[PDB]
Each structure stands twice: as structure tokens, then as C-alpha cells.
Design a protein around this ligand. Sequence first.
Ligand code: NA
Ligand SMILES: [Zn+2]
Lengths: 422, 4
Amino acid sequence: PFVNKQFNYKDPVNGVDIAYIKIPNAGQMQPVKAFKIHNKIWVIPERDTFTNPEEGDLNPPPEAKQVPVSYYDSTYLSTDNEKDNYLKGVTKLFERIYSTDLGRMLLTSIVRGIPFWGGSTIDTELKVIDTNCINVIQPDGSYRSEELNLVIIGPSADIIQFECKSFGHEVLNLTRNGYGSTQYIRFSPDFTFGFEESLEVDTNPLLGAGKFATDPAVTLAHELIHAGHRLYGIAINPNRVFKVNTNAYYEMSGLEVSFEELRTFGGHDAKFIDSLQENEFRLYYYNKFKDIASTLNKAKSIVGTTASLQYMKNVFKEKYLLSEDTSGKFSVDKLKFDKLYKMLTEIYTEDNFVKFFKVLNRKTYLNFDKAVFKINIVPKVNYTIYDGFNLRNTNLAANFNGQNTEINNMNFTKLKNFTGLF
Amino acid sequence: RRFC
Ligand code: NA
Ligand SMILES: [Zn+2]
């Protein structure tokens, strides 16, 4: 299993994989109980009022000031039972993802995707960037710095605003300069979205109540794909967008969708990014990887005593699949770069995960959500690692009946409808 | 992130 331990929220802290920690948000915060579910991956069963100082409260703005697709409940994830279920739910989704070859490939890439040690201002020394770490309270009450790649945390004010958040640098664009940075994914396994089976209905903002429920494993996979791009520092600048001209409802409102999102969804959506810009990006990131190789070659000493320079150089050699010649020099091989870049951007996509999970899902990112449902995937009678909602040897096994909110209505409680509110 |  991906998660060797089936943690209980109330399990006693041990200062190793169950501990109170603080994150480098440049601000003050009380320690929060966190769980290390796998090498380099932690889960914090708390609403995220930490990564953004301006989002330190679950207080919702005005009463009509926010987007149609949003859901607020300041009380969500405030009790121990909720946090216990949140932990078990997130764990279950990681196992579901890991049970597929594609998921195993993606999670392996994420674990190997250690944020680059580019914190040194002296080119002859290799140093870590502290915002790619968390401070763990040890048994003696003292703090120890631990590098990590991923943190799954509860959502902020808007419960359904799932996204990757990461701490920036004063001058370096860590998610786009090849370096990478620790990713904090705001996510909840306790809610899901409703979509429509018909493409012309699903992509219309005035039609559909949301008959089918999105499998949350796909939703989490979507964020993990973004996390992968960001951990390898190859995320596409959000300023690069597709001026949607394939949906009149998007067009008439001048809606623009980032290439990063189209890439992440994959399938036909990825084709909206033309060859010219696609090649520009590839070359751009190829150069970024070359800089990493050059930086590694200049480093003659390592800062700290957590690892040897030799070990860290090998760590990044493996991460970026660099070539190490006779002179021990590192360089970027075009073929290896294209292979890794393509793996991270074309193999790991939402559309491909849908094929692996064998679930019904939106056919494009360019649609309109219909509703949001409260769900509970922890009970095996409701959802399993292997079949999601479509439980084998039951009436829910075929035709995605488990995802059919009308047939499997006991597994979904509609909280809000979005149709007509766009 | 999702859009619409
Ligand atoms: Na929209
Ligand atoms: Zn996204």
C-alpha cells in the first residue's frame, strides 16, 4: 500500500510521522497536528488558514460577492471526527490512485521531485530553500526542519476551491524555473461535483442538475498533476491562456482558460495549445534544466549536515534524469528531457486517469459544473480503493451506476445547484 | 483548479 499506516486522527503524536508542525508562511501560527503518510508527503486535516495571510479566516465575503461555483461552511472540518474521516478519505484516494499503473507512475515522479536546493547565493555551495520545509516538533519540544514535496490540506473559506498553493521566492519563480517548490493542495474528499452525461448539456450553463458525480480520485489526481508540474518547475505561467472560441457561452463573456489547465486535463483540450507556443515552452524549460545542471556543476560544497553533496547531486540527477559524463559533469540530454517533460505533461493528465479508473467524468475542462454534493467515501459499503462508487457485484457495478446520483442517491446529498447562476 |  502507498500508505503503510492506517492513521486515526486521535493517535498519539510521536514527533516523526504524527506530529505538531508549523509551515513557513512568513507569519505566526499555532502548531497543527499533521500526518506523514508516505516519504515526502504529509496531510494536515485542517482548513487552510495558513498558506495565505489574507485568507486566515473562514469568513465569507459579502453575500453575493463571490463566484457561482463556491460553497461556504465555516464549521466544516472543525471536529475530531471530521478530521479523522478527512484523513481516512485522503488516504483512501491515494491508494485508489496508487492502485493504477498511471497513479503509481505519477506518485513515484512526485516523490522523486524534491524541490531543488537553490537557496545559496554562493555558486560554489548547494543550499536548501527553507520554504520547501516544515518545522516538526520533536519529542523534546524542539523544532527540526524537514524537507517535503507535498502536503494535502483542507480548503480555505471556499470549501470547493481546490488548488495547489506554494510559497514563492523574492526573485525566483520556483514553479516555472525548473527548481520546484513544496506543494500544498487545498482539497476535500468530503464533497464532489455533479456533471452531465450529454456533452451539449454539460457545456451549457443553463442546463443540467448534475446527474453524475465526479469520482474524487480524479479530482485529487488533477491537483497531483498540477503538483507534478510545479515540483519539476515546469508549470505554464497562468498569464498564458486560451481565449476560448469553441463555446459561445465562454466566448460571449471573454472567458480565458490557462494553458496549464488545458494541459492538465489533456485529451482534446490539450490541442488548443498551438505547436508554436508548445515548442516555446519546451525549449524554455529545457534551458531551465540546463541551468540546474550548470548550478550542480559549480557546487563544490554542501550547506548543512543532513546529507552529503554527493547524495544531493545524485538526488537531482535522478529527478531531472541528467547525464553524468566521464568528467563527472552533469548535462541535460535532449531525449531524456523530452521523455520526462512529456511524461509529466502528456502522460499524467486527467483524461488518462479517467481511462484508468474506468469512471464517467466531464469530457472537457471547458464545461459548466452543475452542483456540489456532500459524500462519504470512507465506508467500504460506499466507496472502495478498487471500484470507487461503482462497487463490483452489486447494482452499482455497471453503467457507472455508482456515480449516478439518482440511482445511488443514498451516497449523495446535493448542497447547491450552480446551473442558471452563471 | 477548476474554472467553471
Ligand atoms: Na465560469
Ligand atoms: Zn486545475
